[PDB]
């Protein structure tokens, strides 16, 4: 009780707080999915620009 | 209210009751004669103080770490 700071039970436990890990997994999947597309676009642009000028 | 037979415990004749055995040479063993063998805890009281302190402290440590 003294260490928790709560007289009833722990806090930040529960599916409302546990689900955030799975939300992070999904968010990271989406973020990498979009970042790969953006990196491919930028790489195509750079490979065009350099070999046209350089 | 009640007849004398119920009060005195017999209708006609008072029956002899077998007395209680004593077991000479040793202490009586009954539900009320157990403090002869089991006194209140008196040997590990200071250890109780120490262990209560350490239990409180360790519980608080791990609970705070879990919460944080
Ligand atoms: C107080 C309520 C009762 C007061 C009068 C009745 C009484 O004390 O009779 C003795 C009564 C029972 O007799 P006992 O056989 O000596 O009990 C063993 C003690 O509990 C064993 O614990 P202890 O009392 O010997 O030592 C434990 C120690 C532990 O110290 C800590 O680390 C706790 C830190 C708390 C913050 O705590 C303290 O002594 C003082 C710090 C405050 C507690 O002991 C108590 O109730 C007093 C301690 C209870 C503290 C928590 C109560 C909830
Ligand atoms: C659980 C075991 C009961 C512990 C009782 C301690 C004791 O010896 O017993 C002692 C206590 C009485 O303590 P006091 O003599 O100090 O009043 O209770 C009894 O005399 C009989 C308890 C019967 C219940 C047994 C269970
Ligand atoms: C008062 C208003 C009108 C209502 C009257 C009736 C009230 C009845 C309720 C009270 C009952 C008391 O019941 C009481 O039980 C005990 C049991 O321990 C009986 O006890 C009897 O039996 C025991 C053994 O069992 C015998 O060893 C003992 O000598 C004898 O007294 C009492 O004789 C009886 O009086
Ligand atoms: C969960 O509760 C356990 C209930 O069972 C109680 C077990 O009781 C067995 C106790 O065994 C003994 C036997 C003898 C003794 C002696 C006679 C040596 C004690 C003495 C010398 C203090 C009278 C003590 C304990």
C-beta atoms surrounding A3 within 10 Å: 19
Q: Are residues B64 and A11, on separate chains, in Cβ contact within 8 Å?
A: no
Q: Tell which residue, A34, A36, A32, has the closest CA to residue A24.
A: A32
For the beta carbon of residue B63, count every other beta carbon within 10 angstroms: 17
Residues 7-26 of A with CB under 8 A from B: 10-12
- Report d(CA B38, CA A46) in Å as an integer: 89
Ligand 1 pocket check for B49: Cβ under 6 Å: yes
Q: What is the DSSP letter of B21?
A: P
Resolution, rounded to a tenth of an Å? 2.8
Q: What is the dihedral of CA B24, B25, B26, B31, to 10 degrees?
A: 10
Structural element, H or E, at residue A34: helix A15-53
**Could you give the angle at the alpha carbon of A39 between the alpha carbons of A37 and A40, nearest 5°?**
65
Question: Count of alpha carbons within 13 Å of B16, Cβ hemisphere only?
Answer: 3
Dist. CA A7–CA B15, nearest whole Å: 64
Q: Which stretch of DSSP H or E encloses residue B56? A: helix B45-67
């Amino acid at each position: 009780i003294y260490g928790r700071g709560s007289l009833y039970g722990y806090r930040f436990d529960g599916e409302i707080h546990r689900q955030e890990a799975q939300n992070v997994i999904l968010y990271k999947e989406k973020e990498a999915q979009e970042m790969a597309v953006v990196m491919e676009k930028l790489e195509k642009e750079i490979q065009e620009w350099l070999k046209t000028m350089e | 209210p009640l007849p004398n037979a119920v009060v005195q415990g017999y209708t006609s004749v008072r029956g002899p009751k077998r007395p209680l055995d004593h077991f000479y040479g040793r202490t009586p063993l009954n539900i009320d004669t157990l403090w002869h063998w089991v006194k209140f805890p008196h040997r590990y009281d200071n250890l109780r103080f120490a262990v209560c302190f350490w239990a409180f402290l360790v519980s608080a440590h791990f609970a705070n770490k879990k919460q944080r």
